Design a protein around this ligand. Structure first.
Ligand SMILES: [Mg+2]
Ligand SMILES: [Mg+2]
Ligand SMILES: [Mg+2]
Ligand SMILES: [Mg+2]
Ligand SMILES: [Mg+2]
Ligand SMILES: [Mg+2]
Ligand SMILES: [Mg+2]
Ligand SMILES: [Mg+2]
Ligand SMILES: [Mg+2]
Lengths: 72, 53, 124, 113, 209
RNA sequence: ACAGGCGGUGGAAACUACCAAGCUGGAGUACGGUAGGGGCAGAGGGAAUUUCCGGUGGAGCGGUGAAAUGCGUAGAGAUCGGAAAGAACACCAACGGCGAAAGCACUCUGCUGGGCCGACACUGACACUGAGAGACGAAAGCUAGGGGAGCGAAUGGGAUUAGAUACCCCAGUAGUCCUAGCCGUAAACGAUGGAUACUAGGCGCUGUGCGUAUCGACCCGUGCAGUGUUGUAGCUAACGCGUUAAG
């Protein structure tokens, strides 16, 4: 598949969502928790890049994926 | 091959007491040696080979 | 990070090991820097090639002295200078490579040109 | 034979009693097939082995309460595809049943050695 | 010499290589064979004295015969330290050793006991083992030749200390920066030794005139 | 006067910065392969020890530098047979693997994280570090609820000693274990912060490719990412570091 910016966020959005349901049961899996914050951080720096390059794509991507916008 | 159901291959890497021999005398590789451990430890639970003697 | 900070070192380490070739990276800035060392007599020859779309340059060092080097203006602290404070390394045995509005030149060439600039690295 | 994307390859080797008759193991092998195939499964096979004596004695208690000491037993071997979420019923049945003595469900894979 | 023995120093003077064994370059050395024979031929005309340092068992006698053709000197056995640097002690042992050969001529051995004559015998025998090819030196040489760098590591350093040019064993075993004159390819066999040794000893003969 | 500071004004556009387009080497995604005690959860297994049940049998057993306490004719210890429980996994095992560390080793299975390599899908500098903050975090210890075989602070007893609130010996509580949570400290050490470029080599250990080759694997020859040991330059007060730097 492609490697566009919005596509990487879509895969992380599923990779993140897939692990939340896992931690509801295996909450003591702290090694996976260290991996969960990576994908949460990788998308943070990509969306941080998408923001200052084009705000139109930002408002459209966050709207369909139901993403919380950051203050400041 | 190397697996639990093979007696001839696993029986030549055990001691007279049924213990696991070292990699040096067996002259195996890493991928090989780790499987001889698993194949034996599996078989002992199945009673295909005694834990001791 | 700072490319030129790496350029000055790849030439330094080559003299400590006492080698002839460097295989230094090629850019718009380095081609001007190396061009000064040819005319000034610090390097015997330079030569260009490529392996990919990128480019490189191959230098030819000389065979108890040592090829001293030093960087001055860093990214964390940029250093500029006016005409009256142009340095004079060792009374003339050294030189300073500095960037003017009319490209990069030697400090001596700036003494005649009458225009200071950003000192980047001293040589002796 | 390849596997579909929805499941991978498992196998199972069991240890049955020696005193069982012919008619018993027919119903037993038929019990696990209809139980294993009731869930998501494909390409079930059944090999057979003899009464090779065990390396160490065994203790097993039936529902009646009594125990029995054994030295030989009938071994069976399965090679099949099942879903990942349909193996814990199999392992659960291989412990509650009294005809089965031991159970070892392994997941053999490809290794180049 | 091998994949586990090649020094990265000789990399400018390596052409190719083979199954395990190493292949030396004969091109660059040929210039140095000319520079060596030109310097040795020119030096011999002025009347200098030279020295050869050979103690390898395979070329112990070859270096001995090599010195008889010219008026140079050889070192057949080990270096025993301070031969050239501690020359003041060497003159004492040579002045000593020179006298003992005159001591044996006299009839004083008769009036010495049995054991005392044995000590003087074994004393002179020990000096002959190490001070053979130096009996007619009478001073310090101006150029010193090294046949082996590894076994005679000590001899190469006193030359660097006293500041004397020298020839070395620039084959892959050693460091080429120790000698100004460079002649590789001498660890192969006597063929590599005699082909070079006789060639350099030959040039000394016509230089002597 | 010079030097230097502030403001205005006319020019130069390399560099820092700004603005408009470009590339892929850094980074990341999609794929296709691959090793491992990565982590969590649930099942399975044997010996050994301890206690009880009995059989056999009859005087010591056990311990120490020497002895005693202690156990024992109310039948000990030893010896076969049997019930049960708890905790921990010899051999494999290292010049070994994984993990950010702390740490992870009897077996499988489930869910799940990270790394390496290949290449012809793609992205187009989306990078590094990180004050505050947040998370994880050996043992010990605490708050409830369970469990407790063995070992063992404390506390007793028997000895050694001038003394022995110790070292030794016999018994032994908390705790050591499980599930919830607190505590957030260690020589938590590689006594060495992280990222990046460059800088001689020798030995051999993995993981994954390439090519030769017996193309059955192997072996041999090399690339990449790691992991250990010697060592050149260089550094270092010295010891020593030394391509995984303390250059
Ligand atoms: Mg820049
Ligand atoms: Mg411009
Ligand atoms: Mg902080
Ligand atoms: Mg604890
Ligand atoms: Mg601390
Ligand atoms: Mg630790
Ligand atoms: Mg510290
Ligand atoms: Mg640290
Ligand atoms: Mg070292």
């Amino acid at each position: 598949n492609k490697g566009s910016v919005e596509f990487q966020v879509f895969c992380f959005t599923n990779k993140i969502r897939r692990l939340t349901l896992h931690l509801e049961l295996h909450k003591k899996d702290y090694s996976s928790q260290r991996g969960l914050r990576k994908t949460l951080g990788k998308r943070q720096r990509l969306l941080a890049y998408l923001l200052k390059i084009n705000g139109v794509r930002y408002k459209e991507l966050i709207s369909k994926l139901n993403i919380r916008e950051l203050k400041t | 091959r190397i697996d639990y159901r093979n007696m001839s291959l696993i029986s030549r890497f055990i001691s007279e007491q049924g213990k696991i021999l070292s990699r040096r005398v067996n002259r195996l590789t890493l991928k090989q040696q780790r499987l001889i451990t698993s194949a034996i430890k599996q078989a002992r639970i199945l009673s295909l080979l005694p834990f001791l003697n | 990070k700072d490319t030129i900070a790496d350029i000055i070192t790849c030439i330094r380490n080559a003299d400590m090991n006492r080698k002839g070739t460097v295989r230094i990276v090629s850019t718009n800035i380095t081609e001007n820097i190396v061009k000064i060392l040819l005319r000034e007599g610090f390097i015997e020859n330079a030569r260009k090639h490529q392996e990919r779309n990128k480019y490189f340059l191959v230098l030819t060092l000389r065979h108890l002295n040592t090829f001293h080097l030093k960087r001055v203006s860093r990214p964390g602290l940029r250093i500029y200078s006016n005409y009256q404070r142009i340095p004079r390394i060792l009374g003339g045995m050294g030189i300073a490579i500095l960037s003017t509005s009319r490209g990069i030149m030697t400090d001596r060439e700036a003494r005649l040109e009458g225009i200071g600039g950003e000192i980047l690295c001293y040589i002796w | 034979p390849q596997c579909p994307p929805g499941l991978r390859q498992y196998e199972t080797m069991a240890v049955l009693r020696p005193d069982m008759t012919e008619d018993e193991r027919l119903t037993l092998t038929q019990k696990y097939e209809e139980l294993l195939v009731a869930g998501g499964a494909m390409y079930v096979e059944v090999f057979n082995r003899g009464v090779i004596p065990l390396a160490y004695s065994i203790k097993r208690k039936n529902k009646a309460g009594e125990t029995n000491n054994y030295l030989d037993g009938i071994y069976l071997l399965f090679t099949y595809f099942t879903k990942p979420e349909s193996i814990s019923p199999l392992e659960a049945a291989l412990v509650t049943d009294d005809d089965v003595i031991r159970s070892s469900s392994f997941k053999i894979r490809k290794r180049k050695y | 010499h091998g994949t586990r023995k090649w020094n990265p120093r000789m990399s400018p003077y390596i052409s190719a290589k083979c199954k395990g064994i190493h292949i030396i370059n004969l091109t660059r050395t040929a210039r140095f064979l000319s520079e060596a024979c030109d310097l040795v031929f020119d030096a011999s005309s002025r009347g200098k004295q030279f020295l050869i340092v050979g103690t390898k068992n395979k070329a112990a006698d070859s270096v001995a015969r090599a010195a008889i053709r010219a008026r140079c000197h050889y070192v057949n056995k080990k270096w025993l330290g301070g031969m050239l640097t501690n020359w003041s002690t060497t003159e004492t042992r040579l002045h000593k050793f020179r006298d003992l050969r005159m001591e044996q001529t006299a009839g004083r051995l008769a009036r010495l006991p049995k054991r005392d004559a044995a000590v003087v015998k074994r004393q002179l025998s020990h000096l002959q083992t190490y001070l053979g090819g130096i009996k007619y030196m009478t001073g310090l040489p101006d150029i010193v030749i090294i046949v082996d760098q590894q076994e005679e590591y000590t001899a190469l350093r006193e030359c660097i200390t006293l500041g004397i040019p020298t020839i070395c064993l620039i084959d892959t075993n050693c460091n080429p920066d120790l000698a100004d004159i460079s002649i590789p390819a001498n660890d192969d066999a006597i063929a590599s030794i005699r082909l070079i040794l006789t060639k350099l000893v030959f040039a000394i003969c016509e230089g002597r005139s």
